[PDB]
Amino acid sequence: ISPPSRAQMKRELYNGTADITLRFTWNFQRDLAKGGTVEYANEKHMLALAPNSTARRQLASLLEGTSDQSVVIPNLFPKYIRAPNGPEANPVKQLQPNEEADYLGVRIQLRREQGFLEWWVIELQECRTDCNLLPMVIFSD
Amino acid sequence: IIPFTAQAYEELSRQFDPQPLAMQFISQYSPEDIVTAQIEGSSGALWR
Structure with a gap:
């Protein structure tokens, strides 16, 4: 993130009253050999x-x-996604009833180990091995 | 990216109204058609 805007991003989280667009785009590029017009099935799961x-x-x-936060x-x-050959990663409703509150508890951890060496591990609220390998599912069509 | 509104469209059309074809382009394109290219310029991404 560009340093001035990184400090502004900082500020937002620090104070700046704004709603960062947390678009969790779940792009699912398949193929075209077995068919699949718009193979890439994508949905930006945003978290303001x-x-x-x-x-x-x-x-x-x-x-x-x-x-350490x-x-x-x-x-x-989304732990269950009914993705088709169109451009939509819509999750299965009922599989995840709330489907925004029934997806899968996800956590984030920026690992700035100055040596800032800013890494970014996507953990889980219950990370067992899902800090390095998050196991969700895509109900493919 | 800002989908230009009806009022915004009028502005662009009027800016280039003297030139017939310039205005034509803008006016012919439907409102909420002309989109705004607010491309980011800040870096951070160093280069390699």
């Missing part, structure tokens, strides 16, 4: 980041200097 929420205060400290993203990792 409430100004300085629990998640954004964790992100405030994340971008302040520390790298588990950012709570309220169940936003």
Whole structure:
């Protein structure tokens, strides 16, 4: 992130009352050999980041200097997606009833280990091995 | 990216109204058609 806008991103999470667009685009590029017009089935699962929420205060400290903040993203990792040959990664409703609150609790961890060496691990609220390998599912069509 | 509104479209059309074909392009394209290219210029991405 460009330094001035990184400081502005900081500020948003720090104070700036805005809602960061957390578009979790779930692009599913298939193929065209077996068919699949718009193979890439994509859906930006956005999470408007409430100004300085629990998640954004964790992100405030994340971008302040520390790298030990588990950012709570309220169940936003679709664990069952009815994707077809069109451009939509729409999750199965009922599989995930709330489908925004029944996806899968996802967490984020920026690992700025100055040596800032800013990495970014996508953890889970219950990360067992899903900090390096998140296992969701795509109900393909 | 800003989908230009009806009022915004009028502005562009009037800006280039002297030139007939310029205005024509804008006016012919339906409102909420002409989109705004607000391309980001800030970097951060160093180069390689």
